[model samples]
Target chain A: CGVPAIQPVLSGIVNGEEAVPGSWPWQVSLQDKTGFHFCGGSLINENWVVTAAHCGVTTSDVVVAGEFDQGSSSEKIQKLKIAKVFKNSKYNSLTINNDITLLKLSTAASFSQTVSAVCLPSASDDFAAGTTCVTTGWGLTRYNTPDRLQQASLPLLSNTNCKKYWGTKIKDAMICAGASGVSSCMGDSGGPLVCKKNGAWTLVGIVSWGSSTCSTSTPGVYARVTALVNWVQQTLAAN
Target chain B: ISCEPGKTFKDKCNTCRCGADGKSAACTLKACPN
Candidate 1:
């Protein structure tokens, strides 16, 4: 069996040298013993990391902190024991909708230059249809294999354009970004789609999935954070 | 990403492969078989 492929739309020139993990408020990489792999996430609170529901299994997994270079394997890494995984019940893996998750760590993560959380957008925080947002991830640099962690800033696409490319398959719960030739590919899921408002960083979307091929016409899609405000609050309350 | 039984792998947006029985096929990811 094969996982469906989603193409990515690349935007502005992304010079790997310009990619800095700390620029955004919260950036995390989900990995296992094999190596640094899987989706990216945002530090939401001292003891929680917000990510896509699809990134984690309901099994025990280690959450590594302060990770950038894939070659570095140091014991000094902060390992957070996952106390629980909170996935939205409406999430359908096939449709990849409502794809959000929160990880309650065994203990709170101490804030530092290397660790922090992004602010969630308020219900009133409205972004123009063409606003630009920055997306970062450790997914594939191109299409087939993994690449060094990368960063790219792309425009928030109009819902009409999104529907034109993806059809009515896109729901109000989702938002789109990128413009051909630029996108978050495999392993980039769950990262933050950050926009600056009043000089502060606010998370607007969570990297979901896109067309499998990195094409100009297909933009990457994400879960609209604002659309899930109530669900996020209720889920956090239960746990 | 599992496919139903009996469905051929169709890479469409909403279609997935079915197993021989025409039911959703179970799928898993493991280390590449040596």
Candidate 2:
């Protein structure tokens, strides 16, 4: 991952604000055959993208980087092809556990001011409860999906507290974030949850499941990157 | 969520044993690896 050039302003997806162009360089749009954005992803390396396994992405889908507005075109945008999708072996749909996935690009993404990779957290890294993190995607707003990428600020929730809402469904491999009216919604699945640490941005979570109502007290759930970092490193090394 | 009399089901990371009632089941709180 490269250094984030544009520092994001703290704002509130669900009730999320729009992001500036080229701010979140690592952000990618996962699109289907009709060029419609279905899910969001992040670039962890020149050829690898991180997303949620529930996205059920395929090689036929296209990856668009350096995109802020989905309906517009710009020189900053780079559309690429997917070579393969590596979903975790432990991924379970019934419980929505181990929800992370890695997409290998057929061709290396050309890193630019608008296209860069986001740093991954260490295997043992964990954020304290109430720590603020940013989640970005082109997910649902009040009426419909946003044309511009939506950005939100959510505080991390401890597993104990998270389980109060999700009950036995919450696992150690999962983390929680969100507040009363702010969260990552339906189309935001497979997006990013990044935190600023020591002046650098580290991707700590991958968007998974959340409240069916979109905006509520129910905390949005994500794949804890710390618990799954070992698998990512091992798999990246092997492949 | 009713099931066959003796069929088991998954309870998060653990597997649950089904009872003769076809609805009730039991599971261990064992931590899952991987």
Candidate 3:
């Protein structure tokens, strides 16, 4: 296994459960100056980390990658200082629109069995409704419960159905996942909704906003990673 | 939402769009699913 190196587990892990170590290595803990994990993020390259625009916790400077437990650290940890943040200019706070952003690591990251980048999906790529996707974050299990980094398995949802339930508030550039009793919560903001593409783990969405509640059928809205990869590539090239 | 904002649309489906911060529409119609 080179690069991505993400391996799926065969056990029953779903709905805010503990993830198997090294299962989702790209998962990043986005934190503020005080080391507070307010949002989630993913390493996409040696120098770039993808996150949600609305969370914009890039101001939260430190990005801890290859992390499994937020309460403590392991030898596999890679703590990065963000040199710059590229927020989707069209991102709207009011509408919760276009909520995606990228962070340029101050220094390039070193990859290991526990730290690597995820593949970015193309605009043409499509994952049908009901495709099982993975979401991980140090976010809440309930509301303020940022226990062991939580993981959830959710199914993809159609945009029409998403808009139908979201009151036409969802945009074409957005993607939806989760259902019934499974969904990403508030602390999960800016996390990745990664789906297994062929054999590789490709990032398809960024945790944005959803129902104020998590364990509902409302389906969490994401930044639609496919629609935002170009800017990401360009910015990384320019910076 | 499949199109990556600020980059060229390289797919065969619909759903191109612009960013909230004055970026180019990812699709040709200036928005998708219209």
User: Between 1 and 2, whose DockQ is larger?
Assistant: 1
Write candidate 3's Cα lDDT for A95-210 as tens digits.
Answer: 56777788888889898878888888887898889888888777656535555667777789999888766655688878888775776765677788888888787899887766
Ranking by lDDT, best first? 2, 3, 1
lDDT of 2 by residue, A1-239 (tens): 54767766665458888888788999998888888777789999898999988778899999999888878865568889999889999998667789889999999999878888899988877689989888888877763767888888888999999987667778989998986568676678788899888778899998887654464466888999999999999989988
Task: Give the alpha-carbon lDDT of every model.
Answer: 0.64, 0.79, 0.69
Q: On a 0 to 100 scale, what is the lDDT of residue A33 in model 3?
A: 75
lDDT of 3 at B18: 38
Q: What lDDT tens digits, residue by residue, belong to model 3 across residues B1-34? A: 3334333332222223333333323221000111
Q: After superposition, how far is residue A63 of candidate 3 from its true place, in Å?
A: 0.7
Question: For residues B1-34, could you state the per-residue lDDT of candidate 2 as single tens digits?
Answer: 4656545566444455454567554332211222
Q: Candidate 2 vs candidate 3: which has greater TM-score?
A: 2
Q: How much is the lDDT of residue A25 in candidate 3?
A: 78
TM-score of 1: 0.78
Answer with 1 or 3, whichever has the higher DockQ: 1
The numbered model that scores best in lDDT is 2
Better of 2 and 3 by lDDT: 2
Interface RMSD of each: 7.4, 12.5, 13.5
